[PDB]
Amino acid sequence: GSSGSSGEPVLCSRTTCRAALNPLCQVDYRAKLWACNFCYQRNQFPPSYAGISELNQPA
Ligand SMILES: [Zn+2]
């Protein structure tokens, strides 16, 4: 990705949580949502959810 999309990490909304995107949390790709496994908070997906390499290849 030389001179390309840098991409930024997606940290949970909650400050105390700020848990990175892990395969443990319930990612509702259908409802464009993802529930946390710790704070258990529903966060909406970002407008630029492209760069994110993790997302690109959903496990
Ligand atoms: Zn959380």
From Swiss-Prot:
Disulfide bonds: none annotated. It is found in: Cytoplasmic vesicle, COPII-coated vesicle membrane; Endoplasmic reticulum membrane; Cytoplasm, Cytosol. Ubiquitously expressed. Zn(2+) binds at C12, C17, C36, C39. It comes from the Eukaryota. It is linked to Craniolenticulosutural dysplasia: Autosomal recessive syndrome characterized by late-closing fontanels, sutural cataracts, facial dysmorphisms and skeletal defects. Component of the coat protein complex II (COPII) which promotes the formation of transport vesicles from the endoplasmic reticulum (ER). The coat has two main functions, the physical deformation of the endoplasmic reticulum membrane into vesicles and the selection of cargo molecules for their transport to the Golgi complex. Required for the translocation of insulin-induced glucose transporter SLC2A4/GLUT4 to the cell membrane. Belongs to the SEC23/SEC24 family. SEC23 subfamily. COPII is composed of at least five proteins: the Sec23/24 complex, the Sec13/31 complex and Sar1. Interacts with SEC23IP. Interacts with HTR4. Interacts with SEC16A. Interacts with SLC6A4. Interacts (as part of the Sec23/24 complex) with SEC22B; recruits SEC22B into COPII-coated vesicles and allows the transport of this cargo from the endoplasmic reticulum to the Golgi. Interacts (via Gelsolin-like repeat) with MIA2 and MIA3; specifically involved in the transport of large cargos like the collagen COL7A1. Interacts with DDHD1. Interacts with TMEM39A. The Gelsolin-like repeat mediates interaction with proteins containing PPP motifs that include MIA2, MIA3 but also SEC31A. These interactions are probably competitive. This is Protein transport protein Sec23A. The chain holds residues 57 to 108 of 765 of the full protein.
